[PDB]
């Protein structure tokens, strides 16, 4: 109608097209939520690949944005729903922490704190159908520490011999038994160390598997 009204309408249309273009660009992104109890190797994982840290990387033409909220030391349930709708949760746990108590002792193990955090995030109402890539870092240091000291310090009800393979298998079993949504989500467990160069490949494989299984569910085949 009026010249100013027409200019406003054209401005709004241009803004609309820019917004839809930005949405199209951002839809071609795989969003990952990075978590872990303390510093259990998150930084190592990020190197291998304010208040929230964003790491963007493209692997095999697939773009990933990973959001780390470790420095956010507040009430998690006040913002955890902000990450509803991520493709996957990358949860990092240090295998060497089975004997270390904590930053402040508080007679609670670092491994038990990690297990509690994993249980809470895995069975969170916002992530009923979100998959978890479970990185178990520091396997070399864990092997040394299990050579020197028993695993019974962390898990008193342990019967296997003090060797890396079955100790790590028992730890993985303990972590994966915390999943109550066994018919809705899967846990992709990987033992990592500092020198490993296949972590990004493992994440890519887990993400492609998640995408394919979601498509199968949509087609009624899963």
């Amino acid at each position: 109608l009026s010249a100013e009204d027409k200019a406003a309408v054209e401005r709004s249309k241009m803004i609309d097209r820019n917004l839809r273009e930005d949405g199209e660009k951002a839809a071609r992104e795989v969003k990952l939520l990075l978590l872990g109890a303390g510093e259990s190797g998150k930084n190592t994982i990020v190197k291998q690949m304010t208040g929230i840290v964003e790491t963007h990387f493209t692997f095999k033409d697939l773009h990933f944005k990973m959001f780390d909220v470790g420095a956010q030391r507040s009430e998690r349930k006040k913002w955890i729903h902000c990450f509803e709708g991520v493709t996957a949760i990358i949860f990092c746990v240090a295998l060497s922490d089975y004997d270390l108590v904590l930053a402040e002792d508080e007679e609670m193990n670092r491994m038990h704190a990690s297990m509690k955090l994993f249980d809470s995030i895995c069975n969170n109402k916002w992530f009923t159908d979100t998959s978890i890539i479970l990185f178990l870092n520091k396997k070399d240091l864990f092997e040394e520490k299990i050579k020197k000291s028993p695993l019974t310090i962390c898990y008193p009800e342990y019967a296997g011999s003090n060797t890396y393979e079955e100790a790590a298998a028992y730890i993985q079993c303990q972590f994966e038994d915390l999943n109550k949504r066994k018919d809705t989500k899967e846990i992709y467990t990987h033992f990592t160390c500092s020198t490993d160069t296949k972590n990004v490949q493992f994440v890519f494989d887990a993400v492609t598997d998640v995408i394919i299984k979601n498509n199968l569910k949509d087609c009624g085949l899963f």
């Binding site: 071609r28 066994k182 018919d183 899967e186 995408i211 498509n215 199968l216 085949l221």
Partner: protein
Amino acid sequence: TVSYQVITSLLLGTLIFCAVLGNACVVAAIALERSLQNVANYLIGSLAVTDLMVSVLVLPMAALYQVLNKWTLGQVTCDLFIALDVLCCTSSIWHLCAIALDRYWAITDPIDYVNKRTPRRAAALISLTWLIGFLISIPPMLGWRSDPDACTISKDHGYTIYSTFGAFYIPLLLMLVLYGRIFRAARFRIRKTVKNERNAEAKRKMALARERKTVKTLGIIMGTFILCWLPFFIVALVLPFCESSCHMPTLLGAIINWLGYSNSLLNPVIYAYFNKDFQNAFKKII
């Protein structure tokens, strides 16, 4: 007439009304609810539109033909009816093919799914489907270079082979191949997953449940299409070649024709009534 045309008309009208209602409900749900607006549902809704066009244009004239045992609408209307029947049925079958192909790409190429899959792809698939329908329906209008009481498609051998293979047999082969590859991919993904013994047994039970579910799904998908359209195209292929050797009973021919036509009624149930998103959308809108 007194005891036969009434029940025949009642049954045919009930079928036509149910088909129209189902397809219209699917289209309305997709056009209303934003949770049903993606490429797959766009293909499904395009299939619903094609089946609705069937049930609105072709099915009434076919039902009148069935009840009166005679074509009363004239030669021009007979030609238009044949063209619409061919176009709409071909478009429906190739819509099934397009849905299968999109599912195959989504299951076998997650990278393409994330990066290069857009509603433009659904638009191109629908356009190609309708183009194939036009290509199958045009030769009768162009001449491909009688009985006034009956409306019958051309019985030329060349056009018979052309129409039957370009409308049902090549699509059937494509559907079989695509869903076989999809079945292999699904079986691989299901089997790749497989106290410790209790967890292992639970995982095995879940894998068996998923295998049975995918077998049931593909069985329903392929069996509906086959048991609806295969007898019709078998008859339409073998009958024109043995003109005098084999005769087709009228009752069996009518059963076969309407069995083929029931696919436009069963496709909504298969594609947008068994789907969880569609069920939730219906519950919300109701």
